[PDB]
Design a protein around this ligand. Structure first.
Ligand code: MG
Ligand code: ZN
Ligand code: ZN
Ligand code: ZN
Lengths: 49, 56, 85, 196, 168, 114, 133, 447, 112, 98, 65, 43, 262
């Protein structure tokens, strides 16, 4: 519940094969959890602060 | 592609798999409940008439 | 005219695994349907085992039609076929 | 699953007698194959187990924060001070016969979680159940007594196997089956056939 | 690069020759440059190989590229499978790509191509052309729910009326 | 949903014999004794006692599967020695040793005030 | 069913080879220089040290279901200190004058090189090797 | 159903539990890992179907994979480790355990093999007890790079008449190998005999492991003080070399590789130096570890793991690569806010100098997380790409079949190949063999 | 030199030696002419295409060219007499086993 | 030598699920991601009023236990008060091959 | 909710000493390890069973029902 | 036959009757446990 | 003579002793029967008449099942499945009643002592809840708030720990032998020194330390097994071991009887 309440979503469609947006940029340090993220199509799009 | 190339099946089961060193290479364990639900239409013959009667 | 004579057959005399499986299945289905059995049964009731024994003894009266891509077919009796397996 | 991304399904349930016991008579609640450690690179699981053992022996909750100053050597030294092997290995005895195991067994408490995924709700079986009105084929979903799907990849795998009879039976007997009448000149299913 | 060459003694020996690799594909003019070995010149792009050398050379280049990509990670695949793949991709006059614009554009059974990505367009094309399907393909029999001419189903099983009598 | 009957592990089923003795054709004078609803506890002890006898040649216990409470003991002795007699002697020796151990433990406990 | 080879060997060097229970010892005959024998020995049961004289013999008399003695009265060629069973699996010729025979005693490798007088050895499963300290 | 061997016929064995159970080996062809995998069982509904499943697609018949003309299914990780431990020359078994192991083999003839050691006491070597499972008449002779008749390390494998003459069993011997024991047993004896051998070996090895034991722990991943000091010294030397290279590049004293630009050349040189340092540290750790080490023993068994795994667990995680290159300057000329602009040192460019045992600094942790995210995204996209490619290939090749005239033709009858694979032989029966005529010198060929 | 091939001759030779118990002492009963005739008969007996016409015979000979080269390399007179010590019965058994394995290795018609 | 700012503690970069992982750095990043994904599926006490809450599907652990090794961020997350799991004695060995 | 009746690992009864454990922690202000040792828990299985337990029963009873 | 969530007082209301508690305005109206014998086992 | 017992120490529910002149298999079988084959009395059936606690009926029933019960006269009691009875007759079961409810502002704690025996024990000291805590309250069962009424009946049958761990009369049965590595049964895992890494066991003082001068004793066999038996409280450790030996002897006698009959 805590993770879901603090979840973030990316409007980019879950489809596609562009890895660049899915990869977490260096700016995510201290703002988005490097490890907490779903695995699969949504990987790299759904982010947890 | 939804009903001709690939279509749903009646006689079939799906469930988790667990390792078993005490089973032969060609032998697969099957739950008793799945075995009861799944059936084979064996035709009555004199060879196994008694066995089929016992099963019935 | 498409049918090729008994001789001058270019197909492999040796039995094919697909052919063996098909013959075993057909024989088992026939036996299960109360078909005549050409081999004495020594306390055996499984149709597949009976079919295997008949194939070993070459008592199966079935035939195989080797169909060429053009359409011509060659007839092969089970007895003459060689079972390498 | 442990707290290090390890997911496992129980293989067998053994009573406390059959499972191996340590020199102190402790019988583990869980046994995990060591092969899970090397490939997964999950070195944190062993360190967590060692820290849990040290905390249980001392009784004080251990700090397992990521960048803590403490190291593995300190935990091993504390465990040794608690009268146990520094690296956590403990001599165990075979429960079947009591013979001492040739190789010592890594042992200790560890935190585990029971995931919602359970076989009781993941087991399904169908035998001539309800079929969809639209296609007269098995419905989808175990909760609705549905049927499994014969995928296209499975279809081509069977084709490679050469089991034409199996595919015909699966797609015409175990699945929707219909008998239709067609003329020999127009070849159209629109044929009036009063069987009675 | 070290090349295995027949030594005078008869045993293969490693000759450290020199090889030039280029980031472009202009084999037509590159092979014309004097001072090189045009017989053993190779190009990564099999399209240029087909255009310059021929259909067989293009097929060989495609097979070599497939083998290289398969063996890049160390996985091994039998030569027969790659040979069959390149043959089917080259069985036509040119190179038939494995896409909806390649083999799916051939004159095979209408239902066989229907099962591919293009489903209704092929049906409309067949209706316009009144295409005839012999139902010799796997997809045709699968749709019709009949034993395809595949392995067990390739042949047929009959009954001998003369051998049965004597077997009794 | 279909877990095994826990009580059935140590309780004989309907129309089931506790012991099933059959001959073994692998070697001369070899027998197989199937013990039903038994675990390693009795099999290992019986086999260890059998191996302690010079006349007994081979004595091996096997558990086919943890699911089923059952095991098989293969016993081969010298010519003219019935395996059943060897098993009976081993069981009698086990009973005698257990009785002696019980008596010693009782005497030691009585001797100690605590 | 009789002894085929018999000699006295002095061990020149012993190499554990990272195995604590088993080691490999190379020895030379004290009578014939050309005779050498390199054998794997379970030092745990039969400890061996460098510069030690051992009497090594090969006998063919102790399917074939192995049995315990079951009695002290039974006697055989047991007047040794370390007895093993193996099978010969290779015979080779060196310098067209020496013959080397390879034995595998349950995974323990032995190579015995000698003159043509060692022809008694045969490629047979039955092969017992006995060593006396 | 990625490949052909993903759907095989098995004999039903009713069990009183709600989970399917299958042999350990068949996991490999199914790519199963028992981490929640759900499989499907289809019951035939006719004698024809039963016969076709039993004769065409049966696990014993599927042992040899036509994809690589080698046995795809072989011994499993735990069984492989157990058999490797059993076959060690120093492994000896007591009479009781030997008798139990002999009885476990269902097809045991009945005769007790003679002990390898007699006078001290009856002892049977692991190889002797293991040989009973192997049927008689099996010959295997594999020599490694440094394998001889008197193999000091017990490397290679020599088995004669079903008796293991010597050698330690590993993946290359009993695993999925073209020249492995499984392949030769299948070719010589048959599929049923191979399945029986699999069962016997699995049972014997499992019993031996149960009565022997095996584990892994923290101490396995730890190396003595001298080894850690040597690893630290090597890492420091690598860092010094990288710093010197960077200083040379700054003074434009470094000659860029032909074609490759100066930045790319410098990055490639730094990456190569870091990889070499990591490999050296891993080699030092491996040599430090002894045979008694559990991780090293498992890696030698071939069950799983590799040099990289040990190096990262004990010696050095190594450089972290994203998109085939070091960590880029996400900020303005800064990988992380903790580093100043224009910081090309390894620590600021994704390099990790601490193994999992000691831990990772927050920057190293973030770089490792970025690498893991890149790997996860790559897998998630490549699985779909490979599935689509396989679908296209299957659709293209669906209609091609070999006829009774030994010609591969499609539905239209067009001949793709006049001979199946230019040989007409079965893919499974093919095996790797050496040609003597091609090799050898003129004098060797003459003699 | 290491390439795919249908049947392993080395395993067949080893099995023949083990089963027939070939001894290096007694001279071999094989003859040079006998060995040559046996090799030629074995080569001619390997059939992958069966047709009474020039085209089919040429195709069959072309298909088994590599295996014929393998047999000649392995079943050489020097190797059979020097490297090996096979006798008449052992050599005949080896030839029969090689022929049977090659025939079994033929592609099964109808395979997808 | 400037360091105009500094982190209160690096471990705070981790999320709610990641912080639950003991020694995340000692573990490989893909394993940490898998653990974070799986933690959402762990069965445990989600609220103290589940008796009155008529949720569509609720899972309650019989005997919730706090981990022996807990990250200092767990108390802020109140994981110790509502743990999801139990401490079991694990032996890392291949005993019966199952 | 309540302390487990018996230890999961060995089966030793540990529910009797939970109240004694709390009293020792509060009344005597003793450390966790010392209190557990005084209660008579040698094996670390019971030590972690008692130490790791959480009293959710009181929290549930806080509600009116 | 019924009890109040807050008052926890029996109501024993019948059909075609208001489902609101008589004592208070709350209308959760929980129902008491069945009178049929219930048995459980520690297994 | 046979095997002899040397009791190093004894206590109310913990006895440490040494077994000599006994085979390893016999000791292992004794431990197995003592941990699993000893009959014991524990709550088997729970009937709920009025339960309104925050807990669940199954949860409280499971907790009650684990509650130890006196089983000194368990041999006199007979299994329910054996005796011809309709259901839980006094001759094969023990019946207890649990009643409790809260009040204004004091939570009601339910302990083992709250259970009241209702069936006729015929002068048998069996089924009494076991109390060992200094306070004497017993095993905490649950907590009741104001208005929460707990009212149930418990039926305890004779059974063995194999059917369910609740019948386990012994918690931990420590079994050790060969403290010093004399038989080479275990290869100690070492990185610097095997002796330093692995601390000496407590029992090591009772055996002579090994001497490097002498060679390995290949004729030595497992002997002098140190066994420490701890009792949950249902049966004293001495009676626990006595009943384990009796059960093993009875099983062997049953095997002999089956052999004779067949
Ligand atoms: Mg998986
Ligand atoms: Zn405990
Ligand atoms: Zn109200
Ligand atoms: Zn009764």
């Amino acid at each position: 519940t805590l993770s879901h309440l603090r979840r973030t979503n990316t409007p980019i469609g879950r489809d596609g094969k562009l890895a660049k947006p899915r990869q977490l940029h260096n700016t995510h340090w201290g703002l988005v959890c490097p490890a907490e993220t779903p695995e699969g199509q949504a990987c790299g799009l759904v982010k947890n602060l | 592609r939804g009903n001709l190339m690939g279509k749903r099946v009646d006689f079939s089961a799906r469930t988790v798999i667990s390792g078993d060193p005490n089973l032969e290479l060609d032998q697969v364990g099957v739950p008793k409940s799945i075995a009861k639900t799944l059936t084979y239409p064996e035709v009555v013959t004199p060879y196994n008439i008694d066995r089929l009667t016992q099963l019935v | 005219e498409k049918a090729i004579p008994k001789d001058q057959r270019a197909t492999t005399p040796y039995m094919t695994k697909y052919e063996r499986a098909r013959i075993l299945g057909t024989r088992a289905l026939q036996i299960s349907m109360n078909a005549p059995v050409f081999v004495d049964l020594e306390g055996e009731t499984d149709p597949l085992r009976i079919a295997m024994k008949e194939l070993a003894e070459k008592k199966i009266p079935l035939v195989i039609r080797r169909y060429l891509p053009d359409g011509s077919f060659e007839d092969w009796s089970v007895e003459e076929l060689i079972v390498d397996l | 699953a442990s707290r290090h991304g390890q997911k496992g399904t129980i293989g067998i349930t053994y009573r406390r007698e059959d499972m191996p016991f340590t020199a102190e008579g402790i019988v583990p609640d869980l046994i995990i194959n060591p092969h899970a450690i090397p490939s997964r690179m999950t070195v944190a699981h062993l360190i967590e187990c060692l820290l849990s053992k040290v905390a249980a022996l001392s009784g004080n909750e251990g700090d397992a924060s990521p960048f803590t100053d403490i190291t593995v050597e300190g935990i091993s030294k504390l465990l040794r001070e608690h009268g146990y092997q520094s690296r956590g290995f403990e001599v165990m005895y075979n429960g079947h016969t009591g013979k001492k195991l040739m190789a010592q067994i890594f042992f200790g408490p560890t935190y585990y979680q029971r995931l919602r995924h359970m076989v009781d709700d993941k087991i399904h079986a169908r035998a001539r159940g309800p079929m969809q009105v639209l296609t007269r084929q098995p419905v989808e979903g175990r909760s609705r007594d549905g049927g499994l799907r014969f995928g296209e990849m499975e279809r081509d795998c069977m084709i490679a196997h050469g089991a034409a009879s199996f595919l015909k039976e699966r797609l015409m007997e175990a699945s929707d089956a219909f008998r239709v009448h067609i003329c020999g000149i127009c070849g159209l299913m629109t044929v009036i056939a009063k069987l009675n | 690069y070290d090349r295995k060459v027949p030594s005078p003694t008869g045993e293969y020996v490693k000759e450290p020759e020199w090889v030039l690799e280029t980031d472009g594909v202009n084999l037509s003019e590159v092979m014309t440059v004097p001072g090189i070995d045009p017989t053993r010149i190779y190009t990564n792009s099999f399209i240029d190989i087909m255009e310059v050398l021929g259909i067989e050379a293009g097929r060989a280049a495609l097979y070599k590229e497939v083998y290289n990509v398969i063996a890049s990670d160390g996985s091994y695949v039998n030569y027969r499978h790659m040979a069959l793949l390149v043959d089917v991709m080259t069985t036509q006059g040119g190179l038939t790509s494995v896409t909806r614009h390649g083999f799916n554009r051939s004159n095979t059974g209408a239902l066989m191509r229907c099962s591919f990505e293009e489903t209704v367009e092929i049906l409309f094309e067949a209706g316009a052309s009144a295409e005839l399907d012999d139902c010799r393909g796997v997809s045709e029999n699968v749709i019709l729910g009949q034993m395809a001419p595949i392995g067990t189903g390739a042949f047929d099983v009959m009954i001998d009326e003369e051998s049965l009598v004597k077997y009794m | 949903m279909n877990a095994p009957d826990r009580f059935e592990l140590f309780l004989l089923g309907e129309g089931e014999s506790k012991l099933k003795i059959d001959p073994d054709t692998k070697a001369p004078n070899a027998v197989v004794i199937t013990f039903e609803k038994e675990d390693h506890t009795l099999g290992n002890l019986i086999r260890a006692e059998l191996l302690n006898d010079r006349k007994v040649l081979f004595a091996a216990y096997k558990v086919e599967h943890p699911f089923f409470a059952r095991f098989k003991l293969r016993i081969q002795t010298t010519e003219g020695y019935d395996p059943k007699d060897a098993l009976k002697n081993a069981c009698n020796s086990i009973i005698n040793k257990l009785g002696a151990l019980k008596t010693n433990f009782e005497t030691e406990w009585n001797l100690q005030t605590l | 069913s009789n002894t085929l080879f018999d000699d006295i060997f002095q061990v020149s060097e012993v190499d554990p080879g990272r195995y604590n229970k088993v080691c490999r010892i190379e020895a030379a005959s004290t009578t014939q220089d050309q005779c050498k024998l390199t054998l794997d020995i379970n030092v745990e049961l039969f400890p061996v040290a460098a510069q030690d004289s051992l009497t090594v013999t090969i006998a063919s008399s102790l399917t074939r279901s192995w049995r315990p003695p079951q009695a002290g009265d039974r006697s055989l060629a047991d007047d040794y200190d370390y007895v093993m069973y193996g099978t010969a699996y290779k015979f080779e010729e060196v310098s067209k004058d020496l013959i080397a025979v390879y034995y595998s005693f349950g995974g323990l490798l032995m190579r015995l090189e000698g003159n043509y007088r060692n022809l008694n050895n045969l490629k047979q499963e039955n092969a017992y090797l006995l060593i006396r300290r | 159903s990625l490949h052909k061997m993903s759907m095989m016929a098995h004999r039903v064995k009713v069990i009183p539990y709600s989970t399917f159970r299958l042999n350990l080996s068949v996991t490999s062809p199914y790519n199963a890992d028992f981490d929640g995998d759900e499989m499907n069982l289809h019951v035939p509904q006719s004698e024809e179907t039963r016969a076709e499943l039993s004769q065409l697609c049966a696990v014993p018949l599927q042992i040899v994979s036509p994809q690589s003309n080698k046995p795809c299914m072989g011994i499993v990780q735990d069984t492989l480790c157990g058999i490797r431990k059993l076959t060690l020359r120093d492994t000896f078994i007591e009479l009781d355990q030997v008798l139990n192991m002999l009885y476990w083999v269902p097809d045991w003839d009945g005769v007790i093999p003679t002990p390898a050691i007699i006078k001290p006491k009856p002892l049977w070597s692991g190889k002797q007890i293991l040989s009973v499972a192997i049927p008689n008449g099996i010959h295997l002779q594999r020599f490694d790079e440094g394998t001889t008749l008197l193999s000091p390390k017990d490397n290679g494998m020599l088995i004669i008449d079903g008796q293991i003459i010597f050698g330690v069993v590993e993946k290359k011997t009993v695993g999925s190998s073209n020249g492995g024991l499984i392949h030769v047993v299948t070719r010589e004896k048959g599929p049923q005999v191979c399945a029986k051998l699999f069962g016997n070996i699995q049972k014997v090895v499992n019993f031996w492991l149960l009565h022997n034991g095996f584990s892994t722990g923290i101490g396995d991943t730890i190396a003595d003080g001298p080894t850690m000091r040597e690893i630290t010294e090597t890492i420091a030397e690598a860092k010094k070399k990288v710093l010197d290279v960077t200083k040379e590049a700054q003074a434009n004293l470094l000659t860029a590789k032909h074609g490759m630009t100066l930045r790319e050349s410098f990055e490639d040189n730094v990456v190569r130096f870091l990889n070499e340092a990591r490999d050296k540290a891993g080699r030092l750790a491996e040599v430090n570890l002894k045979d008694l080490n559990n991780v090293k023993q498992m890696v030698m068994a071939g069950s799983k793991g590799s040099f990289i795994n040990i190096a990262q667990m004990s010696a050095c995680v190594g450089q972290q690569s994203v998109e085939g290159k070091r960590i880029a300057f996400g900020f303005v000329d800064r990988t992380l806010p903790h580093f100043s602009k224009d910081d090309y040192s390894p620590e600021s460019k994704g390099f990790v100098e601490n193994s999992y045992l000691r831990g990772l600094t927050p920057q190293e942790f973030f770089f490792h997380a970025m690498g893991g995210r890149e790997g996860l995204i790559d897998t998630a996209v490549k699985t779909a790409e490979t599935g689509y490619i396989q679908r296209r290939l299957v659709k293209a090749l669906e209609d091609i079949m070999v006829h009774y005239d030994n010609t591969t033709r499609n539905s239209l009858g067009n001949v793709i190949q006049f001979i199946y694979g230019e040989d007409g032989m079965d893919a499974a029966h093919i095996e790797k063999q050496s040609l003597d005529t091609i090799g050898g010198s003129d004098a060797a060929f003459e003699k | 030199a290491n390439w795919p091939l249908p049947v392993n001759i080395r395993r067949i030779i080893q099995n023949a030696q083990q089963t027939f118990h070939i001894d290096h002492t007694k001279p071999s009963d094989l003859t040079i002419k006998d060995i040559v005739l046996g090799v030629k008969d074995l080569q001619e007996n390997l059939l992958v295409l069966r047709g009474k016409n020039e085209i089919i015979q040429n195709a069959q000979r072309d298909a088994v060219t590599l295996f014929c080269c393998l047999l000649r390399s392995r079943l050489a007179t020097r190797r059979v007499l020097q490297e090996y010590r096979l006798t008449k019965q052992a050599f005949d058994w080896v030839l029969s086993n090689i022929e049977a394995q090659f025939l079994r290795s033929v592609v099964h018609p109808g395979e997808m | 030598t400037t360091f105009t700012h500094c982190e209160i503690h690096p471990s705070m970069i981790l999320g709610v699920a990641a912080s639950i992982i003991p020694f995340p750095d000692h573990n490989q990043s893909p394993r940490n991601t898998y653990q974070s994904a799986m933690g959402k599926q762990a069965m445990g006490v989600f609220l103290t009023n589940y008796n009155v809450r008529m949720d569509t599907m609720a899972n309650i652990l019989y005997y919730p236990q706090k981990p022996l090794g807990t990250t200092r961020a767990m108390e802020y997350l109140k994981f110790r008060e509502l743990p999801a799991g139990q401490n079991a004695i694990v032996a890392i060995a291949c005993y019966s091959g199952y | 909710m309540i302390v487990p009746v018996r230890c999961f690992s060995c089966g030793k009864v540990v529910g009797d000493k939970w109240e004694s454990y709390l009293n020792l922690l509060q009344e005597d202000e003793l450390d966790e390890g010392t209190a557990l040792s005084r209660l008579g828990l040698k094996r670390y299985c019971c030590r972690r069973m008692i130490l790791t337990h959480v009293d959710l029963i009181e929290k549930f009873l806080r509600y009116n029902p | 036959k019924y009890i109040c969530a807050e008052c926890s007082s029996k109501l024993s209301l019948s059909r075609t009757d208001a489902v609101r508690c008589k004592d208070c305005g709350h209308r959760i109206l929980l129902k008491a446990r069945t009178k049929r014998l219930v048995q459980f086992e520690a297994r | 003579e046979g095997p002899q017992v040397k009791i190093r120490e004894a206590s109310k529910d913990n006895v440490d002793f040494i077994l000599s002149n006994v085979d390893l298999a016999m000791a292992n079988s004794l431990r197995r029967v003592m941990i699993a084959e000893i009959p014991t009395l524990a709550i088997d059936s729970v009937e709920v008449e009025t339960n309104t606690t925050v807990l669940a009926d199954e949860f409280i029933a499971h907790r009650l099942g684990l509650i130890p019960l006196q089983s000194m006269d368990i041999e006199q009691l007979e299994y329910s499945r054996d005796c011809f009875c309709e259901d839980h007759c006094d001759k094969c079961s023990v019946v207890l009643t649990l009643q409790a409810f809260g009040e204004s502002e004091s939570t009601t704690n339910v302990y083992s002592k709250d259970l009241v025996i209702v069936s006729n024990l015929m002068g048998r000291n069996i089924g009494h809840p076991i109390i060992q805590d200094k306070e004497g309250n017993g095993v905490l069962i649950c907590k009741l708030r104001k208005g929460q009424e707990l009212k149930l009946t418990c039926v305890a049958k004779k059974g063995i720990a194999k059917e369910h761990a609740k019948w386990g009369p012994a918690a931990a049965i420590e079994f050790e032998y060969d403290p010093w590595n004399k038989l080479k049964h275990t290869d100690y895992w070492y990185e610097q020194d095997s002796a330093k890494e692995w601390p000496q066991s407590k029992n090591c003082e009772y055996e002579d330390p090994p001497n490097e001068g002498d060679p390995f004793d290949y004729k030595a066999q497992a002997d002098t097994f140190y066994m420490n038996v701890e009792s949950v409280g249902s049966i004293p450790v001495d009676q626990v071991v006595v009943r384990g030996i009796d059960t093993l002897q009875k099983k062997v006698a049953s095997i002999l009887l089956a052999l004779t009959q067949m």
